[PDB]
Amino acid sequence: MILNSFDLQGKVALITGCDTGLGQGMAIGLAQAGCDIVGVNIVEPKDTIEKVTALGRRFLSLTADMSNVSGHAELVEKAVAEFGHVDILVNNAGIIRREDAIEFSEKNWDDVMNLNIKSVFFMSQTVARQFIKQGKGGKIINIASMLSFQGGIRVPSYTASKSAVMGVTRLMANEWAKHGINVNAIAPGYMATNNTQQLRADEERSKEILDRIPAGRWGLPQDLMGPSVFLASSASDYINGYTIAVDGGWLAR
Amino acid sequence: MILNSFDLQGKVALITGCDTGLGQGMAIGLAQAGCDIVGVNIVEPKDTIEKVTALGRRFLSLTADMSNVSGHAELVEKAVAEFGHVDILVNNAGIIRREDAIEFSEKNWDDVMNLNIKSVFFMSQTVARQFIKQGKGGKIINIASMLSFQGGIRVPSYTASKSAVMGVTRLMANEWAKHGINVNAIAPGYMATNNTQQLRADEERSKEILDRIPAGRWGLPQDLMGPSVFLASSASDYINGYTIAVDGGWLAR
Amino acid sequence: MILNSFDLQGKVALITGCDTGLGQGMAIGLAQAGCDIVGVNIVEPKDTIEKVTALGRRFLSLTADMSNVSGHAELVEKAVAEFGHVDILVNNAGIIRREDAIEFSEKNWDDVMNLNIKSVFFMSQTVARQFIKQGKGGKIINIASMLSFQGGIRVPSYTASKSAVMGVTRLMANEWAKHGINVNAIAPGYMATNNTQQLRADEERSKEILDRIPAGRWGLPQDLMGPSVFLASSASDYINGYTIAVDGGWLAR
Amino acid sequence: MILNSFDLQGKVALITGCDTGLGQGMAIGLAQAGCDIVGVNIVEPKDTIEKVTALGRRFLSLTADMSNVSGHAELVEKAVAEFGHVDILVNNAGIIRREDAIEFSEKNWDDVMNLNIKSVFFMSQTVARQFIKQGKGGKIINIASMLSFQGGIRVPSYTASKSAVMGVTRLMANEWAKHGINVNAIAPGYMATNNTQQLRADEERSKEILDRIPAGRWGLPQDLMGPSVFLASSASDYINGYTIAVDGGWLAR
């Protein structure tokens, strides 16, 4: 019965960057679907912990800098120690730096690439090793962007990193699908989170964007709950290496 | 609670081409999720009806040639009369004609285009009118192909029609998303149905294709149940105009 | 010496719809590169004839409705009787019909599809047969659109046809590369022609679109001269089945 | 007269990595079209220098590690001193590291990303600054890959970097089009160079890839001469932010 395929009871999901915004939404969604949650954040995600534990699920809160690739194994080991296994990885921890491309600093390049693509590859590798050890497959959900498809402006390292995310998602699937590992990505559209706060404070810019969203509204963290559960579940077993836009029709227009 | 967002109880899904293979799978999946089913087929979908009614769901079987666009309004009227509303359309009715491109007949062009793209647009229009009347949104799921992305050989009208499907899915979303109508597409990979019967019976070709599917297996009708329920449900509300490959990694490789 | 590769001395190019706008530009550019031209038009291309003749090149002006696929063989026969051979085809003849998708008529569907995709496939076939008879390969250049990539609004049959063009270009290359035939496409951006007459008049819409073209200007027929000569020449021999956007950065933004 | 638009007489082109294979091919093609050449290489490009000077063009041979981004400014300063201006940049310097994704080392990540994407961005930035100082626009040609579109296997940092190249090409076009700068990319297919030596030695794998190239042949450095001249010339002025596959139909199949 197909509805059972979406049920994540007994599963363990590790989500990086789930104190706020989109990551918090995905953590709560996965928990509502039955997952126990391992968070990796720079600060204790108090609100997310409250919401997850209110569902009767467990939350293991790890505090770490995801850009430090030497630390990833330890994060996964803690998760495996508590729950016995890790089944789902959501590589949501990311940053953005805005600066004219002609002036763009090496720091704004390195900081963004280090987190948005390098740490994503290496955390995926770390968790995939654990999936292979367990022998029961696994799910990796990367977070792409509209700037995986379009160039944008003033964010060269962001566009580079997010375009790279879409590419490496393909390669990871190619190599690991044979182990029952599904590596896919979600490309959120224009979502009303802290990352579009400047844009939305400008009435004229805000309307310019909104009028180009067919759905006629901004995305919210809630909009990623269903897509993330879907991609984390057996309901999407023959989807692999693919980026799904959750954009209210942005790319369609 | 997100699992409720996948639940299609109380919904009515109209699926064209559901006597066999992929269409049969999607109809059964939708029924398993709670949908009553309206079928449109050239012949009685006897097995599909048995399976749907075994779930305790209703099945209205309409017999018609989907290529006859003047007949669509009546099909939808009959669906609406029987159930009170139609909530989901799956445009699966399709054919393929194989012939060297240099020799390709006008018949093998027209027959494929009339069904695979023309009737898809006009049936979508017909149902969209009903969605707008009802005022509770709606879902359209078109069926794309790997040949929406790649050219293939000996099937010009199929490649044309399925590439067109991907495009027109975008435009339908652009115009109708404001009414809470989601128009998306599923692009199946190489699936174990009658359409690949000759390919799968040739062990050389078969192995050559399988070796380029990361999943290392053919797709099955059951692999479309989850994705179709997802795209027919509230769990995908902010996905619009988009084509999701269900291909075992084919496009990623 | 690489500049010799762009030289089309002694070539014969058949361009459909070259009385004005983009088709006129491409015909003139092909003529400047050394081509004699065969035009196929609904109205006599008087201006194009003058400009091609002024270069010292020959222009055979054929008059026909390109949607009539039964007439294609004759058109190529006429070209071969006059010039002895055909080396290059540009499938530029096309139309657009604007009407709300929910209201879209069968007429506005059929008229656009018959010309923009059906006649393109069948003319390509007809010329390909001639290329094969001659035994020295050939070039086909189809005309895609930004609406091969994006959905747009109020033009379902145009989006369908132009998306189909991009796809069928791939299949033609796959099947006919073995006959030494290159089949590629040009996707013009927003070009200043009769098509964008409404848009460019509307001052508010015009500014809104121009501000989203990185080049900051509308495209011109002149902008397709270089690209069409490139794709018609030996300088692009290892490009096949591919669509090249000539769009001032539209898709990049 | 359109053939004059391909002529690069009086132009200066800086090509990184042009001692062998594809980079050599593009340097020679640009020189054949009229360009004086500035090379940046690890080793002295003896054969390339001989071939460029034999055409009667100048070759300034600079020796540097392109990954050292602090060194870029001086490289461009020397080019500007020696020729008075730089008009064209080809970012060809790159590497590849093959290792199973599950074992992939940090070194094999960093070395590839540092050269293939980081240095490409910063060298582009460095030259763009000079294009702006000069006030006469400029051309940048980046080198993408089939692995900008597909995932491949055992080369996660290569796929990441080349996917990033395709993305950042879009952003560079968006931001720098206002300075009269075109930024585009060439995606070579499977080319017979050092980089495909092993593949082409193994006759089983060699044939099966060859069978999936519609052209029926490996690409060669000479295949990039025409497309690079085209993208370096006024003939491609309304092309910006776009990637052109030179792949014998690989992506089409």
Backbone torsion region of residue C241, taken as left when φ is above 0, otherwise alpha when ψ lies between -120 and 50, otherwise beta? left
Sign of the Cα torsion A252, B4, B7, B9 reads negative
Residue in chain C lying closest to D240 (CA): C249
Q: How was this structure determined?
A: X-ray
**Given the structure tokens 């099955």, which residue do they identify?**
B220
| Subunits with 3+ C-beta pairs closer than 8 A to B | A, C, D
Q: Tell me how far CA of residue B221 lies from CA of A83, B201, B213, B226, in angstroms.
A: 34, 19, 17, 10
Summary count for chain A: helices (H), strands (E) = 9, 7
Residue in chain A lying closest to B181 (CA): A215
Distance of alpha carbon A143 from alpha carbon A109, whole angstroms: 19
Burial B36-52 (b: 16+ CB within 10 A, else e): bbbbbbeeebeebbebb
* Total number of residues shown for chain B: 253
Distance of alpha carbon A220 from alpha carbon A193, whole angstroms: 7
Which residues, other chains included, contact A227 with Cβ-Cβ below 8 Å and sequence gap of 6+?
A186, A244, A246, B235, B236, B239
Contacts of B251 in chain D (CB under 8 A): 150
Distance of alpha carbon A19 from alpha carbon A4, whole angstroms: 29
Whether the CB of A125 is below 8 Å from some CB of chain B: the reply is no
Q: Which of B116, B171, B184 to mutate to test binding with chain C, by most C CBs within 10 Å of its CB? A: B171
Per the CB < 8 A criterion, the answer to whether C88 and C30 are in contact is yes
Closest CA to A100 of D179, D72, D237, D240: D179
C-alpha torsion A233→A235→A241→A244, nearest 10:
-90
D9 C-beta neighbours (distance < 10 Å), count: 9
Strands B88-91 and B138-143: parallel
* DSSP codes of every residue in C57-110: --EEEEE--TT-GGGHHHHHHHHHHHHS---EEEE---------TTT--HHHHH
Contacts of C252 in chain A (CB under 8 A): 150-151
What is the DSSP secondary structure assignment for residue A50, as one 8-state letter?
A: H
* DSSP codes of every residue in C148-183: GTS--SS-HHHHHHHHHHHHHHHHHHHHHGGGTEEE
Per the CB < 8 A criterion, the answer to whether C90 and C16 are in contact is yes
Three state DSSP letters for chain B: CHHHHHCCCCCEEEEECCCCHHHHHHHHHHHHCCCEEEEEECCCCHHHHHHHHHCCCCEEEEECCCCCHHHHHHHHHHHHHHHCCCCEEEECCCCCCCCCCCCCCHHHHHHHHHHHHHHHHHHHHHHHHHHHHHCCCEEEEEECCHHHCCCCCCCHHHHHHHHHHHHHHHHHHHHHHHHCEEEEEEEECCECCHHHHHHHHCHHHHHHHHCCCCCCCCECHHHHHHHHHHHCCHHHCCCCCCEEEECCCHHHC
What is the DSSP secondary structure assignment for residue A34, as one 8-state letter?
A: T
Whether the CB of A253 is below 8 Å from some CB of chain C: the reply is yes
| A171, amino acid identity | L
Q: Does domain A1-253 have CATH number 3.40.50.620?
A: no
Asked if A158 is an active-site residue, the reply is: yes
Strands C59-63 and B243-246: unpaired
**Given the structure tokens 């983009």, which residue do they identify?**
C22
Q: Which of A158, A190, A238, A242 is catalytic?
A: A158
Q: Token digits for C62?
A: 């054929």
Sheet holding B88-91, edge to edge: B59-63, B36-41, B12-16, B88-91, B138-143, B181-188, B243-246
What is the DSSP secondary structure assignment for residue C191, as one 8-state letter?
A: B
Whether the CB of C131 is below 8 Å from some CB of chain B: the reply is no
Distance of alpha carbon D237 from alpha carbon C248, whole angstroms: 8
Residue in chain A lying closest to B55 (CA): A1
* Total number of residues shown for chain D: 253
- Tell if the CB–CB gap between B163 and C167 is shorter than 8 Å: yes
Please provide residue A91's backbone torsions phi and psi, each rounded to the nearest 5 degrees. Answer: -90, 70
Which residues, other chains included, contact B214 with Cβ-Cβ below 8 Å and sequence gap of 6+?
A173, A174, A175, A177, A178, A240, A241, B248, B249, B250, B252, B253
C-to-D residue pairs, Cβ atoms closer than 8 angstroms: 158
Q: Tell me how far CA of residue C28 lies from CA of A173, C24, C142, D113, in angstroms.
A: 48, 6, 17, 45
- Tell if the CB–CB gap between C167 and B171 is shorter than 8 Å: no
C-alpha torsion B68→B73→B76→B78, nearest 10:
-100
Give C244 to chain D, closest Cα distance, Å.
Answer: 7
Distance of alpha carbon D243 from alpha carbon D104, whole angstroms: 28
Whether the CB of D106 is below 8 Å from some CB of chain A: the reply is yes
Which residues, other chains included, contact D203 with Cβ-Cβ below 8 Å and sequence gap of 6+?
none
Whether the CB of B211 is below 8 Å from some CB of chain C: the reply is no
Distance of alpha carbon D51 from alpha carbon D36, whole angstroms: 12
Which residues, other chains included, contact A231 with Cβ-Cβ below 8 Å and sequence gap of 6+?
A139, A141, A182, A184, A186, A239, A244
Q: Tell me how far CA of residue A62 lies from CA of A24, A84, A232, in angstroms.
A: 14, 16, 21
C245 pairs with which residues across the strands? C187
CA A217 to chain centre: 21
What is the DSSP secondary structure assignment for residue A232, as one 8-state letter?
A: T
* DSSP codes of every residue in chain D: -GGGGG--TT-EEEEES-SSHHHHHHHHHHHHTT-EEEEEESS--HHHHHHHHHTT--EEEEE--TT-GGGHHHHHHHHHHHHS---EEEE---------TTT--HHHHHHHHIIIIIHHHHHHHHHHHHHHHHTS-EEEEEE--GGGTS--SS-HHHHHHHHHHHHHHHHHHHHHGGGTEEEEEEEE-SBSSGGGHHHHHSHHHHHHHHTT-TTSS-B-GGGGHHHHHHHHSGGGTT--S-EEEESTTGGG-
Q: Token digits for A76?
A: 């996964």
User: Helix, strand, coil shares of chain C as percentages rounded to 5?
Assistant: 50, 15, 35
Burial B148-169 (b: 16+ CB within 10 A, else e): bbbbbbbbbbbbbbbbbbbbbb
Q: Tell me how far CA of residue C247 lies from CA of B208, C189, D166, D244, in angstroms.
A: 39, 4, 16, 13
CA A253 to chain centre: 24
CA C4 to chain centre: 24
Summary count for chain C: helices (H), strands (E) = 9, 7
Q: Tell me how far CA of residue A131 lies from CA of A31, A71, A142, B198, in angstroms.
A: 20, 18, 16, 36
Element (H, E) at C37: strand C36-41
Give B83 to chain D, closest Cα distance, Å.
Answer: 45
Whether the CB of D253 is below 8 Å from some CB of chain B: the reply is yes
Query: For chain D, what is the largest distance between any 2 Cα atoms, rounded to a whole number of angstroms?
Result: 56
Closest CA to C18 of C78, C89, C107: C89
| C191, amino acid identity | M
Choose among C162, C166, C171: nearest Cβ to B156: C171
**Given the structure tokens 């939404």, which residue do they identify?**
A25
Q: How far apart are the first and last CA of chain A?
A: 36
Burial A145-159 (b: 16+ CB within 10 A, else e): bbbbbbbbbbbbbbb
Distance of alpha carbon C45 from alpha carbon B76, whole angstroms: 48
Per the CB < 8 A criterion, the answer to whether B148 and B162 are in contact is yes
Contacts of D247 in chain C (CB under 8 A): 238-240, 242
Helix or strand or coil: residue C3? helix
Please provide residue B174's backbone torsions phi and psi, each rounded to the nearest 5 degrees. Answer: -55, -45
CA A150 to chain centre: 19
Three state DSSP letters for A118-164: HHHHHHHHHHHHHHHHHCCCEEEEEECCHHHCCCCCCCHHHHHHHHH
Sign of the Cα torsion A215, A221, A223, A228 reads positive
Closest CA to A126 of A37, A166, A66: A66
Which residues, other chains included, contact D38 with Cβ-Cβ below 8 Å and sequence gap of 6+?
D12, D13, D14, D15, D59, D60, D62, D78, D79, D82, D83, D86
Q: Token digits for D242?
A: 């776009």
Distance of alpha carbon A92 from alpha carbon D86, whole angstroms: 41
- Tell if the CB–CB gap between D6 and C1 is shorter than 8 Å: no
What is the DSSP secondary structure assignment for residue C121, as one 8-state letter?
A: H
Cα Rg of chain C (Å, integer): 17
Give C210 to chain D, closest Cα distance, Å.
Answer: 13
